[model samples]
Target: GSHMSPDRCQDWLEALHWYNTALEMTDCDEGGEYDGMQDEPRYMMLAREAEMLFTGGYGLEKDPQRSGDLYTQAAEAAMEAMKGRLANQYYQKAEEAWAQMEE
Candidate 1:
C-alpha cells in the first residue's frame, strides 16, 4: 500500500530503526573489504532514510517532497560510486517516488 496502516506503522518503524542501526554498524569505511564501500553504504542509508520519511510513521508527518529529495540524493551518490545495477535501481526508485509525490 502507498500508505501504511496505523496499526502496522509502529512495528515497521521499529524494524526500520533496527535495520538502519545494523546498516550503520557495518564496517564500510575507506579501503574497507569492499571498494567504495564507504559511499555506497552511505547512499543506501540515505535511501533507507528517505524510505522512512516517505513512509512517515515514526513521530514525523509524511513529507513526500522531502523524501523525494533524499531519494534523489541517494541516487546521485550511487551513480557517483559506480554502483551499477544498484544505482539503476536507486534512480528508478527515486523517479518513482518523485512521480508519486507529483500525483
Candidate 2:
C-alpha cells in the first residue's frame, strides 16, 4: 500500500529472499573450492530475475529492458564460465527481449 501494493508484500519478500540467496551461492566473493558448481546459481539469479521483469507486476512495470540486459550479462557470465552454448542461448533470449522493445 505504501509503496506499490501492500498485498504483494509476501511476493516481494519471497523474490528478494531467493534473489539474495542465489547471489550468496556464487563464487569470486568468498572461500571454499566449489569450482565444480561454478557459474550456476549466479546465472539462475540473473535469468530468474530477468523472467520476473519480463512477466512484471509483482509491483512494477514491464521492465523488459532490464530483463534483456540481465540476459546479456548472463550470457557474458556464462561465456566466461566456458559454457559456450549456454551463453549463446542467453544471448539469443536477450536479443529477443530487446527486439520486443524495439517497436
Candidate 3:
C-alpha cells in the first residue's frame, strides 16, 4: 500500500527533522535518528530530500534514475513499515485508491 508504516515513516521524519535541525543549530548532528517526533509528511519530506540528493548525484554523483529507484525503495520501506498500523478499512482504501500501483 502507498500508506507507509509508522516506523518507516518515523525514520524518514527523524532524518528530515534532524537534517533541518542541523541546518538551524549548526552545532550538533542528529545522525539520522529522530525519536518519532515527526509524522508521515515529515518522512515524505525527507524521502524527497534523499531522492534529490542521491538522484542528482550532486554531492556524490548524479543519477536521476537511481535516485528515483532509491525513492521508490524508500517509499516501499515506508509502506511496509506502516503495514501493521493499517486497519482493514485502510487496506481497502489503499486497494481502491492505488489498484494500478499493485504489482
Candidate 4:
C-alpha cells in the first residue's frame, strides 16, 4: 500500500548497487565503479543485513559461508574507513557465524 519516494528509491538502488559491488569484491576483483561505496556506513549496514538474512534463511537458502563472508566484507569496509568499533563488532559476528557453521 505504500511506495518509495523517488529519492529513497534511488538511495536504495545505490545501496543495492553497492551491495552487489561488495559481493563481487569478495570474489577478489579489484575493478569496479563503486569501490567508493564500500567505505560508506550504509554499505556496511547493508552487508551486515544481507549476511544475517542470507544465513537465517529469510527467503533464500541458508548459506553460512556467504554470511560469514559478508560479515568479513563489512568488517573490512569498516576497517578501511577507520570505523574501529564497527569493524571489531562485525569481525566478532563473523567469527560467531564461523563457529556455528558446519564443516
TM-score (all chains, Cα) for each model: 0.54, 0.55, 0.29, 0.49
Alpha-carbon runs more than 4 Å astray in model 2: 1-40, 57-60
Q: Predicted candidate 2: what Cα RMSD to the true structure?
A: 16.3
lDDT (10s digit) by residue, model 4, range 3-101: 322222233233333443221323221122323343346545756574655566456555666776787787666555544444555555666666665
> Quick one: ranking by lDDT, best first?
2, 1, 4, 3
What are the clashing pairs of model 4?
none
Clashing residue pairs, candidate 2? 1-6
lDDT of 2: 0.55
Best candidate, lDDT-wise? 2
lDDT of 3 by residue, 1-103 (tens): 5433244445444433343311132223222433433555433543455446443433646444444444444544454444212222222222332332343
For lDDT, candidate 1 versus 4, the one ahead is: 1
* Predicted model with the maximum TM-score: 2
Model 3 pairs in collision = 5-81, 5-82, 56-62, 57-61, 57-62
What are the Cα lDDT values of the candidates?
0.54, 0.55, 0.38, 0.50
Q: List where candidate 3 sits over 4 angstroms from the true fold.
A: 1-58, 83-103
Model 4: CA > 4 A from native? 1-39, 53-58
| lDDT, candidate 1, at 75 | 58
lDDT by residue for model 2 (1-103), tens: 2332123224323332343212132222212222334344576578767777777736646687898888878766655554444455566667667767665
Error of 4 at 44 (Å): 2.5
lDDT of 3 at 100: 26
